[PDB]
Amino acid sequence: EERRRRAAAVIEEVEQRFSTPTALLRGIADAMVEEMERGLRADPHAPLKMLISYVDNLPTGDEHGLFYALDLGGTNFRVIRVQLGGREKRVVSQQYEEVAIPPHLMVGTSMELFDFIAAELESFVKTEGEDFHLPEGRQRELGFTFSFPVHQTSISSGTLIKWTKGFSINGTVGEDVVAELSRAMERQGLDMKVTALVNDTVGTLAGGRYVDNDVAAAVILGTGTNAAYVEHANAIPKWTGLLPRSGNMVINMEWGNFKSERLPRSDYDNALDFESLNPGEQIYEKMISGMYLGEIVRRILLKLAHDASLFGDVVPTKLEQRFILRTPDMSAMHHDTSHDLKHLGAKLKDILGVADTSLEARYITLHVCDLVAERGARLAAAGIYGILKKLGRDRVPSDGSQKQRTVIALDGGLYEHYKKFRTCLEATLADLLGEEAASSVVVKLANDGSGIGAALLAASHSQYA
Ligand SMILES: Nc1ncnc2c1ncn2[C@@H]1O[C@H](COP(=O)(O)OP(=O)(O)O)[C@@H](O)[C@H]1O
Ligand SMILES: OC[C@H]1O[C@@H](O)[C@H](O)[C@@H](O)[C@@H]1O
Numbered sequence: 001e002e003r004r005r006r007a008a009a010v011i012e013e014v015e016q017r018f019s020t021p022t023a024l025l026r027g028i029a030d031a032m033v034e035e036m037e038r039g040l041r042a043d044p045h046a047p048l049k050m051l052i053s054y055v056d057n058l059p060t061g062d063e064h065g066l067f068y069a070l071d072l073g074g075t076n077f078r079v080i081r082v083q084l085g086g087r088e089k090r091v092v093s094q095q096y097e098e099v100a101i102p103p104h105l106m107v108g109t110s111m112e113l114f115d116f117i118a119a120e121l122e123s124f125v126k127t128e129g130e131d132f133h134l135p136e137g138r139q140r141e142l143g144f145t146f147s148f149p150v151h152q153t154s155i156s157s158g159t160l161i162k163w164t165k166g167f168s169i170n171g172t173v174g175e176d177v178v179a180e181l182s183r184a185m186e187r188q189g190l191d192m193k194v195t196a197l198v199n200d201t202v203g204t205l206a207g208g209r210y211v212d213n214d215v216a217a218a219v220i221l222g223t224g225t226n227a228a229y230v231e232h233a234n235a236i237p238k239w240t241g242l243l244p245r246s247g248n249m250v251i252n253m254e255w256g257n258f259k260s261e262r263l264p265r266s267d268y269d270n271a272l273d274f275e276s277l278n279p280g281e282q283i284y285e286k287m288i289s290g291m292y293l294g295e296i297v298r299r300i301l302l303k304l305a306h307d308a309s310l311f312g313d314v315v316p317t318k319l320e321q322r323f324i325l326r327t328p329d330m331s332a333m334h335h336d337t338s339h340d341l342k343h344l345g346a347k348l349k350d351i352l353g354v355a356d357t358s359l360e361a362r363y364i365t366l367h368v369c370d371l372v373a374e375r376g377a378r379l380a381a382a383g384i385y386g387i388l389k390k391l392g393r394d395r396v397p398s399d400g401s402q403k404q405r406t407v408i409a410l411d412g413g414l415y416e417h418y419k420k421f422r423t424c425l426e427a428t429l430a431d432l433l434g435e436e437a438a439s440s441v442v443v444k445l446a447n448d449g450s451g452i453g454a455a456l457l458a459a460s461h462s463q464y465a
């Protein structure tokens with residue numbers, strides 16, 4: 001039919017707006033670095049907040065003792081505990097428990113959120129076993145990972161700037177996040193002190209360097225996206241105090257808020273942001289992150305189902321529901337290799353509520369997944385490239401000389417579990433770097449590395465007891 005040429009025009013504008021030629025990706029990485037300079041000088045209306053984390057020393061390995069850690073969590077939260085042995089023994093024992101965050105606790109009362117996470121910590125310590133030991137009359141200490149933007153005022157205190165990725169809890173914005181948790185921990189009859197609070201990009205970087213000395217940055221790709229690196233304290237113009245002893249400082253970029261006119265956006269991105277929980281915010285993240293990838297696919301499939309009767313001569317009701325197509329669903333369809341795409345189609349049945357799909361519709365669906373995941377994974381690589389160019393690792397030494405070994409720790413379910421996304425991320429990064437430079441960059445997987453990373457930073461910041 002013509003219905004066919006109508007569908008072709010839609011897919012063409014998608015592959016036209018989503019187009020990310022390497023040349024454009026270079027300009028975006030350039031813009032990323034200009035925005036990093038902007039945030040470190042505290043330019044007003046800076047997208048990149050570039051927040052001082054007060055982490056001036058990443059873990060050395062001489063960490064010793066018993067420390068707990070709390071990690072929250074865009075979709076989950078975990079309570080961790082480890083007995084750190086020292087330079088030689090290291091981590092002796094380690095236990096953990098992950099709990100899924102109930103959907104209401106993301107949009108309710110902050111007392112409800114922190115009461116829930118503190119009551120799960122309560123029963124977790126109460127099960128403290130035998131290979132963990134706290135010296136007599138000492139107080140247990142907590143490393144707290146907070147995956148949302150926070151304005152830091154010390155290693156263990158900070159103001160919530162805004163909420164992201166699904167959360168919308170009134171009353172916390174502007175309040176100390178550790179004081180809020182501490183209270184809830186008291187309301188639970190629990191004796192614990194939080195000695196280090198850190199983003200989750202900062203936490204992974206800490207836990208990342210504990211097992212690999214060359215880790216220079218950490219990138220998160222889960223329900224949200226963000227990145228942290230180590231910077232030179234002289235390269236931050238808004239620093240006011242007296243420089244750290246190590247001359248280094250970990251910066252939480254909060255790069256999900258990056259916006260640029262070089263970003264390849266479309267009407268599907270405009271509508272998504274318009275109907276979002278935080279409209280206008282987190283523009284970059286809403287093209288990369290797991291919370292938004294499937295939703296972009298659903299909105300493209302919706303244009304096609306309507307302007308092209310792709311799934312029938314009546315748009316399916318389920319397709320009009322926002323966030324009905326989740327990114328792991330998108331992921332499953334994308335990796336279908338069967339000749340007739342029976343597993344993509346079996347997924348479409350559940351999500352659309354249609355009864356069958358044509359083989360052409362399946363192929364169009366598979367192409368939409370490809371275009372959306374590609375744009376996200378390429379732009380994410382362009383961001384990592386920008387970090388490497390901030391640290392001056394986008395190039396090899398001309399001495400000619402030795403080669404640096406630069407490791408970037410990666411964490412999050414999108415990167416860990418979306419295969420194509422992962423290989424497209426790494427291919428583009430190697431493409432963005434030279435063949436020469438790419439042989440010096442390592443993308444390590446440090447799943448949930450903020451859990452222990454926060455406990456390690458709690459160790460170096462003990463009381464001691
Ligand atoms: N199989 C998958 N394919 C694609 N994305 C996935 C998959 N599994 C999980 N994800 C993404 O990872 C996110 C979970 O990652 P995670 O790091 O564990 O938590 P957080 O929600 O804190 O970011 C999910 O929101 C989802 O968007
Ligand atoms: O989850 C990784 C990142 O996702 C972003 O949406 C949040 O603003 C960050 O606080 C977080 O570190």
Ligand SMILES: [Mg+2]
Nearest residue numbers: 076412413448
């Ligand atoms: Mg996980």
